[PDB]
DNA sequence: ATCGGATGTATATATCTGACACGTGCCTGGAGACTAGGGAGTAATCCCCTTGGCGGTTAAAACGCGGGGGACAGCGCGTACGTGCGTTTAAGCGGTGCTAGAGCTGTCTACGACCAATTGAGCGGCCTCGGCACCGGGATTCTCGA
DNA sequence: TCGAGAATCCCGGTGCCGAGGCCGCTCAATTGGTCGTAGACAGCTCTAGCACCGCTTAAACGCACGTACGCGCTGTCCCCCGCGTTTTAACCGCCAAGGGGATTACTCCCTAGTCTCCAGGCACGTGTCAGATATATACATCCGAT
């Protein structure tokens, strides 16, 4: 048994970007699938980068390159900004 | 000995422990950096917020509260960057963006 | 005379021990140290080590009767040297001073070869494309009873010409340009050449140059090299020249380089001149000087400008991918984009003070215009030459410019009008290594040399455009350099190269 | 199963159904031979997808086709589907 | 009585504003589970599996007609013909 | 009079010539220079390999040939033989590239 | 003289000459060509090259190098989904 | 004892040992079986033999003795399944199939 | 700088299907790329396929299903038979 | 050019049902030591790249002209589509019933990981001679203007 | 509609350089053994899938009627092709010197993995009530003849 999901986290983000709306179950399923999809796509690209460069580990730099290589333009720069923000905040704690 | 989750330590809402576990147990590389989960969680949270805001705006436009696959579809298609990202993705029970070719209209 | 005898003489129907041994004994006639190279080669090549332990005063006093044009005294002995070279089963270099008379000298030698040794061809003469027509002219002039052709044109043109004359065997000498040789290497690869003559042998310095390789594959007995200046940069250039001359004797670069290696130097030189003595002659322009007053040289160790200095420092610290910019910086900042602010683009005086060398150049041209001289600026950037063009326009002087990309018709009309009877052309811009050696700028007498080169020989040829025969008052070199700059490094390297050339060759013509 | 295996089930994708799909696609006027072409292309697409889904479900040593199997087949053929797990 | 074109445009606007499935359910279920007997006999199908198949195929067909229409218009027509679908699939890379 | 081929027979000759050889049709230096100029928009102080540009030219020429084939198909569908920018636009639009 | 700028250079996309577009179109198998095709072709080629070079640069930048490699271009093309055989 | 390679044991021409090492180190799974490299090498060898046979056929129809990228291209494009498998692949220095639309032919 | 490549095995296969026929070098490099491509596609499919069923090994079953998924029809059944034959011979030896 | 119909689009009101808050078990994520090996750093070292310019050959590309056929428009006509209206059909839905087969749980054993030794396969370096590219010239084939 | 007439296919002679053997060495397959843990198999259980059945009503089918639209035809410009000068720029060969950019050896430290415990974060299962459907009536609005 024992099936996991991202529904709790998607709901937590939603009720801070639009703290009045809800979300249907089908929509929550769609958003969960979307998150898993993007996670798979970025992780695959990062692993392939590691394989190309003979490195044996996935690191924040490889995640950053994979993001710049998957997302289009404006999304790329915004996402990179927030990724670096979170990383520095975390490591200074 | 206070149990401070990395997810809170980084200031995110998405889980960083779960992302790290998926990276380790997902057959991506032998070793996984320390900040890699934090970065990837940040990116996922950003993308989720970006899509979810447009979906909520569309839901308000249709004067409804709870967002639905139709609203997600509208957000993705009306936006251009998300539409380029999800170029080959079909969204179940979504719809089609309303569009009628000009020639077909009456004179 | 007999075309069919020539036909069986030319085509090749199929370890030259005897002549090779004759040349080793001829060499060991002089001091045995000259057999160092031979013994090294023998120790490395087994096929000649067994050879070593096997152990006509044709002064030709008078000018050749068969050729007209009574000969000037100094080159009869050159003829004799060539003849002796021939009847010694060895090759040689002739390296006169670009004007002492070399085409005539070689043609006299060829005439002697034909009319006293009874051998009407075959001979090959390879020249730069500029001087091809000349060769035909003097061969038709001095010894008119001979046949040749320029061997040039379109594809089918050379094809028909070779099938008519070359493999038709209707020639005594054939003259062709370097690129022709590299292109028509097939038919000329089987002619059983008597001689191969190269004028301006600079082209063969790098052995790996494709022309050099194609030259090694040709079939001939003896080779003759005609040139102006050997050893532009290093001894390895003479190494390659001697490889081509005598491949058997000279076959180890490492021996040459190590055993010479630049008092240990005095111990080297006392060997050095002896080794090469029976291979190449160098005349002096002062032999039958009779003219060109020596060149008057000078240097103007200019400083730098405020923008010039800021740009220089800006490049010292860190789109720009070379140290060459540093020479660019000292030349004129407008070469970069990021000076001459605007853009409104004025021709005004904001030039001369803006760069350093421009100020002194302006002063000199003032002092020379106000007395009646003409100038031959020789910078080494065509693009920079355009800035001098604009500046000259501002002061409203009269151009005549030959860049690297000026078509030959423009070249000839420009040199004509500038060298026409007295006209209004104060300045003559030009880029250093351009035009070849046939330019006859004897009108002017100022050879200001805005930029300097990595080797002195290019400069010397540049001064030769006005120090050649003709101009008979004086010549004024005015090389410029910015102190505390990389051009000091370039200048010192060039000067020490010139010293090395002095030591190696310019003691030979003292004897010669 | 013992379901009395049937043929000519493609005609169940009827003319009004094809017309409605065309209208959603934005098509005003439709010729009369387009329905057979539509049935052919639908049959081909279904055959590909169902073949891959059956391959997955049979490798897993199962006997029931699952939504995950269909989703994997679609993702394999390049038609990623959101909403049915993933 | 409306004129040819009017009711077609009304239907276009209706169906681009809805979200439901345009093909029936039992007919598509029968078609799927009798295509599938060419690869292995006696299969069972999750209801979610049949629904996923239907949604995917309807999406595919709608996106196909959406390009058949451009092919028809580019040829200076407003009627879609089998040659238009053949061209659409040919260019799209299927055939 | 000097004889003249009717309009349409040199074009077929060239089709059946170029559709049988294998060399590169775009020149070399112009394409390499274009590649430099496009690239220095993203990162300044960058250099390429000759093999890198060669691969890039292979890919691009293949892309353009395959684009022109579908362009021709669209033009024939339009009951023409001349290919017009409308055809490029339709081919790129259908194929999902725009 | 105001001529120390010396050209505008038709900068670079008009280096894909109309005979070259004609050759590519013949190899594609077309008989007659309109006069405006030689500008659509340039536009679409520029788009394709930009998309490829962006990813090749990103790869060679992540590898901490300063030179772009045939392998990087191959990876970029495969990433776009245009696998190219023959360059390792 | 005496060494006896896994390729010889299998009867293959492709390196089972190298396939096994690549499969382990390629980050594909935690463990690899023993029959996996054998199966994979056999399949790769079959595909190579098919394509090379077709290419050689073409090179002999051309009346030359060596396979070149032109023959590789021409053999792949002329086989239905072999070309289906390689739709999104471009052979470097290959070519195109001789093909002219009929409508473009002279009357 | 030892660099491995499927050159000699391709040449061994060639010398038995057309015993007198050469292969220049660019054809060989193309064939090396093709072998690598196909290996990557099959191994990636097998990785995914094992992961979906929670398995941790890659077995000949995963490889067989991957080749059945990626190859078209008649080209797939021959490869399946060849692979099974090789496995049986190796396991019997 | 306006009425008359037909189809939206609001606005009210009633009924559901499925988001959503809340508690409950537990399992996983966190905390804290130890360690080893990956990767960062240093330094050879060497080989291809950069900048600016020169010289020459030779096809391609550019450009201008005539003129031919194709694109585009307009006209006509005759089907094949769309729109309505009865009539029949079968999908949708609620409901019952049964059982095959997903999905978990336990044991254990065969089989893959890991290691040390050992030895041939394979890779790089190197030499050579046939395959194929190219070049006349001769004959043959398709275009085309009578 | 047949004899130009040019383009192509096809023969030999080069020649040259790359494929293809051959050898040394080195390092990664192979052998033999240790051993721990996935997976294989059985058994259980209980969920969901298949199988019908009756009833309603909405969608499908069939047939009619009449336009408007697709296609064929006829001109007619005009713009693209074929061809003959004419210029230009790719493409080799060169010079000159750097240096900097990639690429092996070599050391070492610090950051991952690996462990052992253990408590809160998160998922499951529950009980609501309010945001969605789902009728109804009435007003607005295109659309189509007049
Ligand atoms: Cl002279």
Q: How far apart are alpha carbons E29 and E36 in whole angstroms?
A: 11
Closest CA to B59 of B78, B74, B76, B81: B74
Method: cryo-EM
Closest CA to I68 of C437, D55, E22: D55
Q: Is D69 exposed, middle or buried (0-12, 13-18, 19+ CB in 10 A)?
A: buried
- Give the DSSP letter string of H7-51: HHHHT-SS-HHHHHHHHHHTTS-SEE-SHHHHHHHHHHHHHHHHH
Closest CA to B43 of C143, G48, A86, C309: A86
Instruction: Answer whether F77's CB lies under 8 Å from E87's CB.
Output: yes
Distance C112 CA to ligand 1 centre (A): 19
Structure token pair of residue C448: 């200001």
Establish whether C100 is an annotated binding residue: yes
Q: How far apart are alpha carbons C156 and C505 in whole angstroms?
A: 45
CA of B4 to C1' of K118 (A): 14
What element of type H or E holds C197?
strand C193-198
Helices F50-77 and G70-80 sit at what angle, rounded to 10 degrees? 30
What element of type H or E holds F76?
helix F50-77
**Residues 6+ away with beta carbon under 8 Å from C18:** none
Full residue range of the structural domain in which residue C333 is found: 295-511
| B36 CB inside 7 Å of strand K | no
**Residues 6+ away with beta carbon under 8 Å from B35:** A59, A60, A87, A90, A91
Q: Which of E56, E62, E78 sits opposite B104 (nearest CB)?
A: E78
Cα F94 to the center of its chain, rounded Å? 18
Structure token pair of residue C70: 């009574």
Establish whether C338 is an annotated binding residue: no
Structure token pair of residue C372: 């009646």
CA of E45 to C1' of J96 (A): 21
How many residues are listed for chain C in this entry? 512
Distance F90 CA to ligand 1 centre (A): 70
Q: How far is G76 from chain F (nearest CA, A)?
A: 10
Half-sphere exposure of H54 (CA within 13 A, CB side): 20
Residue ranges of domains in chain A, CATH in brackets: 1-93 (1.10.20.10)
Q: How far apart are alpha carbons C323 and C315 in whole angstroms?
A: 9
Instruction: Answer whether F2's CB lies under 8 Å from H94's CB.
Output: no
Q: How far apart are alpha carbons A7 and A22 in whole angstroms?
A: 12
Q: How far apart are alpha carbons H103 and C45 in whole angstroms?
A: 72
Q: What is the DSSP letter of B65?
A: S
In chain B, which residue ranges form alpha helices assigned H by DSSP? 6-9, 17-25, 36-61, 69-78, 81-85
**Do both C378 and C412 map to the same domain?**
yes
Instruction: Answer whether F73's CB lies under 8 Å from E91's CB.
Output: yes
- Residue C122: is the preceding peptide bond cis (ω within 30°)? yes
Half-sphere exposure of C243 (CA within 13 A, CB side): 21
Full residue range of the structural domain in which residue D1 is found: 1-84
Q: Is B76 an interface residue toward A (CB < 8 Å)?
A: no
Q: How far apart are alpha carbons C356 and C446 in whole angstroms?
A: 20
By C1' distance from the Cα of H4, the closest nucleotide is: K30
Q: Can you list the pairs that F62-65 forms with residues at least 24 positions away whose Cβ atoms lie under 8 Å?
A: F62/H90, F63/G48, F63/G82, F64/G24, F64/G28, F64/G41, F64/G44, F64/G45, F65/G24, F65/G27, F65/G28, F65/H96
Establish whether C99 is an annotated binding residue: yes
- Between β-strands I57-58 and H66-67, what pairing exists: parallel, antiparallel or unpaired? unpaired
Q: Can you list the pairs that B26-29 forms with residues at least 24 positions away whose Cβ atoms lie under 8 Å?
A: B26/A43, B26/I51, B27/H27, B27/H28, B27/H29, B27/H30, B27/I47, B27/I51, B28/A43, B28/A44, B28/A46, B28/A47, B28/A50, B28/A58, B28/H27, B29/A47, B29/A50, B29/A55, B29/A56, B29/A57, B29/A58, B29/H27
Instruction: Answer whether F22's CB lies under 8 Å from H95's CB.
Output: yes
Phi, psi of G23 (to 5 degrees): -65, -45
Structure token pair of residue A33: 């699938």
Closest CA to F63 of G18, G47, G87, G56: G47
* Distance linking the first and last C-alpha atoms of chain C: 39
Q: Do G85 and I34 touch (CB under 8 A)?
A: yes
**Do both C192 and C310 map to the same domain?**
no
Q: What is the DSSP letter of C280?
A: E
Q: How far apart are alpha carbons D46 and H56 in whole angstroms?
A: 37
Helix, strand, or coil (residue E34): helix
Q: How far apart are alpha carbons I43 and D21 in whole angstroms?
A: 39
How many residues are listed for chain D in this entry? 86
Instruction: Answer whether A86's CB lies under 8 Å from B38's CB.
Output: yes
**Residue showing tokens 């032999």:** C287
Q: What is the DSSP letter of D32?
A: T
In C317-428, which residue ranges form alpha helices assigned H by DSSP? 324-331, 356-369, 382-395, 408-419
Cα H85 to the center of its chain, rounded Å? 10
**Do both C230 and C327 map to the same domain?**
no
Instruction: Answer whether H44's CB lies under 8 Å from H14's CB.
Output: yes
**Do both C238 and C385 map to the same domain?**
no
Establish whether C357 is an annotated binding residue: no
Entry resolution (Å): 3.0
Nearest residue of F to residue C320, measured between CA atoms: F45
Beta strands in chain E (DSSP E): 44-45, 79-80
C-beta atoms surrounding I79 within 10 Å: 24
Distance C148 CA to ligand 1 centre (A): 19
Helix, strand, or coil (residue G67): strand
Q: How far apart are alpha carbons D3 and C446 in whole angstroms?
A: 109
Which of D2, D4, D65 to probe by mutation at the E interface, max E CB count within 10 Å?
D65
Q: How far apart are alpha carbons C405 and E89 in whole angstroms?
A: 55
| F3 CB inside 7 Å of strand J | yes
Which of B91, B95, B97 to probe by mutation at the D interface, max D CB count within 10 Å?
B91
- Give the DSSP letter string of E35-59: HGGGT-SS-EE-HHHHHHHHHHHHH
Instruction: Answer whether C349's CB lies under 8 Å from C394's CB.
Output: yes
Half-sphere exposure of E27 (CA within 13 A, CB side): 14
The residues in F 21-40 lying below 8 A from G, measured between CB atoms, are 25-27, 30-31, 33-35, 37-39
Q: Is I24 exposed, middle or buried (0-12, 13-18, 19+ CB in 10 A)?
A: exposed
Q: How far apart are alpha carbons C19 and D47 in whole angstroms?
A: 87
Full residue range of the structural domain in which residue F81 is found: 2-98
**Do both C152 and C299 map to the same domain?**
no
Helix, strand, or coil (residue D11): helix
C-beta atoms surrounding I45 within 10 Å: 20
Q: Do E74 and F70 touch (CB under 8 A)?
A: no
How many residues are listed for chain E in this entry? 95
Closest CA to H27 of I65, A66, A56: A56
Q: C81 in a domain, yes or no?
A: yes
Q: How far is G2 from chain C (nearest CA, A)?
A: 7
Number of domains chain G contains: 1
Give the CATH number, domain containing residue F87.
1.10.20.10
Closest CA to D56 of D42, D76, D79, D82: D76
Number of domains chain C contains: 2
Q: How far apart are alpha carbons C109 and C423 in whole angstroms?
A: 42
Structure token pair of residue C431: 């880029």
Q: How far apart are alpha carbons E55 and E66 in whole angstroms?
A: 17
Instruction: Answer whether B27's CB lies under 8 Å from A50's CB.
Output: no
Domain B1-107 has CATH 1.10.20.10: yes
Strand J: which of residues 34-93 in chain H lie with Cβ below 7 A? 34, 59, 64-66, 68
Instruction: Answer whether I48's CB lies under 8 Å from I40's CB.
Output: no
Q: Which of D55, D60, D68 sits opposite I69 (nearest CB)?
A: D55
**Residue showing tokens 């055959």:** D47
**Do both C273 and C310 map to the same domain?**
no
Structure token pair of residue I1: 């700088």
Instruction: Answer whether G74's CB lies under 8 Å from F55's CB.
Output: yes
**Residues 6+ away with beta carbon under 8 Å from D37:** E82, E85, E86
Q: What is the DSSP letter of C196?
A: E
Number of domains chain F contains: 1
Cα E24 to the center of its chain, rounded Å? 12
**Do both C208 and C120 map to the same domain?**
yes
By C1' distance from the Cα of B21, the closest nucleotide is: J29
Phi, psi of C172 (to 5 degrees): -115, -45
Do H and I make contact via 3 or more CB pairs under 8 A? The reply is yes
Q: How far apart are alpha carbons C187 and A66 in whole angstroms?
A: 61
Closest CA to C134 of C436, C465, C460, C444: C436
Instruction: Answer whether C389's CB lies under 8 Å from C441's CB.
Output: no
Q: How far apart are alpha carbons C345 and A19 in whole angstroms?
A: 61
Structure token pair of residue B32: 């996984």
C-beta atoms surrounding G46 within 10 Å: 15
Instruction: Answer whether C508's CB lies under 8 Å from C282's CB.
Output: yes
């Amino acid at each position: 048994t024992r099936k996991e999901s991202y529904a709790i986290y998607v709901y937590k983000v939603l009720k801070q970007v639009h703290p009045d709306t809800g979300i249907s179950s089908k929509a929550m399923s769609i958003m969960n699938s979307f998150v898993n999809d993007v996670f798979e796509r970025i992780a695959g690209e990062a692993s392939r980068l590691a394989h190309y460069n003979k490195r044996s580990t996935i690191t924040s730099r490889e995640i950053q390159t994979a993001v710049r290589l998957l997302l289009p333009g404006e999304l790329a720069k915004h996402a990179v900004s927030e990724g670096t923000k979170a990383v520095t905040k975390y490591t200074s704690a | 000995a206070k149990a401070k989750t990395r997810s809170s330590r980084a200031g995110l809402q998405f889980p960083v422990g779960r992302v790290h576990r998926l990276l380790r147990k997902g057959n991506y590389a032998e070793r996984v950096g320390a900040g890699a989960p934090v970065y990837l969680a940040a990116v996922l949270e950003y993308l989720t917020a970006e899509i979810l805001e447009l979906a909520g705006n569309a839901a308000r436009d249709n004067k409804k509260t709870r967002i639905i696959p139709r609203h997600l579809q509208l957000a993705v298609r009306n936006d251009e960057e998300l539409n380029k990202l999800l170029g080959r993705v079909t969204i179940a029970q979504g719809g089609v963006l309303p569009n009628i070719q000009s020639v077909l209209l009456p004179k | 005379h007999d075309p069919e005898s020539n036909k069986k003489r030319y085509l090749l129907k199929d370890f030259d021990l005897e002549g090779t041994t004759k040349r080793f004994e001829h060499l060991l006639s002089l001091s045995g140290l000259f057999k160092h190279f031979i013994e090294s080669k023998a120790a490395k090549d087994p096929k000649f080590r067994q050879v070593l332990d096997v152990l006509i005063e044709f002064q030709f006093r008078e000018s050749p009767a068969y050729v007209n044009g009574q000969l000037r005294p100094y080159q009869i002995q050159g003829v004799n040297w060539l003849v002796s070279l021939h009847k010694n089963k060895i090759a040689g270099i002739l390296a006169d001073e670009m004007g002492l008379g070399k085409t005539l000298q070689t043609i006299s030698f060829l005439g002697y070869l034909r009319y006293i040794e009874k051998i009407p061809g075959p001979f090959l003469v390879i020249a730069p494309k500029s001087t091809l027509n000349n060769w035909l002219r003097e061969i038709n002039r001095w010894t008119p009873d001979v046949n040749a052709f320029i061997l040039q044109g379109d594809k089918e043109e050379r094809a028909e010409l070779i099938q008519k004359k070359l493999l038709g065997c209707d020639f005594d000498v054939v003259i062709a340009s370097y690129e022709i040789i590299i292109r028509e290497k097939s038919p000329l690869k089987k002619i059983n050449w008597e001689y191969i003559i190269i004028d301006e042998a600079h082209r063969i310095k790098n052995e790996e140059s494709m022309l050099s390789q194609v030259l090694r594959e040709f079939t001939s007995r003896n080779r003759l090299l005609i040139t102006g200046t050997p050893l532009q940069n290093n001894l390895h250039e003479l190494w390659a020249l001697l490889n081509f001359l005598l491949p058997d004797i000279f076959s180890d670069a490492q021996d040459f380089d190590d055993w010479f290696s630049s008092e240990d130097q005095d111990k080297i030189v006392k060997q050095l001149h002896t080794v090469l003595q029976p291979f190449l002659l160098r005349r002096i322009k002062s032999d039958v000087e009779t003219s060109l007053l020596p060149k008057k040289e000078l240097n103007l160790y200019v400083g730098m400008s405020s923008m010039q200095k800021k740009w220089y420092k800006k490049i010292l610290e860190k789109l720009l991918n070379i140290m060459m910019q540093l020479r660019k910086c000292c030349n004129h900042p407008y070469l970069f984009d990021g000076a001459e602010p605007g853009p409104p683009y004025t021709t005004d005086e904001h030039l001369v003070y803006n760069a350093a060398k421009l100020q002194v150049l302006d002063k000199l041209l003032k002092k020379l215009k106000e007395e009646g001289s003409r100038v031959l600026i020789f910078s080494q950037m065509s693009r920079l030459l355009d800035i001098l063009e604009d500046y000259c326009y501002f002061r409203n002087y009269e151009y005549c410019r030959i860049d690297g990309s000026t078509a030959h018709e423009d070249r000839i009309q420009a040199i004509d009008d500038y060298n026409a009877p007295d006209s209004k052309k104060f300045v003559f811009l030009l880029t250093t290594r351009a035009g070849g050696l046939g330019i006859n700028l004897t009108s002017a007498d100022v050879v200001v040399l805005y930029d300097s080169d990595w080797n002195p020989q290019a400069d010397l040829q540049a001064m030769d455009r006005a120090h050649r025969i003709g101009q008979k008052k004086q010549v004024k070199v005015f090389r410029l350099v910015t102190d505390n700059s990389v051009e000091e490094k370039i200048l010192e390297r060039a000067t020490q190269k010139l010293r090395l050339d002095q030591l190696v060759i310019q003691q030979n013509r003292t004897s010669l | 199963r013992h379901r009395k295996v049937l043929r000519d089930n493609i005609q169940g994708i009827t003319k009004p159904a094809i017309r409605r799909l065309a209208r959603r696609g934005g098509v005003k006027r439709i010729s009369g031979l387009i329905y057979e072409e539509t049935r052919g292309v639908l049959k081909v697409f279904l055959e590909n997808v169902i073949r891959d889904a059956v391959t997955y479900t049979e490798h897993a040593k199962r006997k029931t086709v699952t939504a995950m199997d269909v989703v994997y087949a679609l993702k394999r053929q390049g038609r990623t589907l959101y909403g049915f797990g993933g | 009585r409306y004129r040819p074109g009017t009711v077609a445009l009304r239907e276009i606007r209706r169906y681009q504003k809805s979200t439901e499935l345009l093909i029936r359910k039992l007919p598509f279920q029968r078609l799927v589970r009798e295509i599938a007997q060419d690869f292995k006999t006696d299969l069972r199908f999750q209801s979610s599996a049949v629904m996923a198949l239907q949604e995917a195929s309807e999406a595919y067909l709608v996106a196909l007609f959406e390009d058949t229409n451009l092919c028809a218009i580019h040829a200076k027509r407003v009627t879609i013909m089998p040659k238009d679908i053949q061209l659409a699939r040919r260019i799209r890379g299927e055939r």
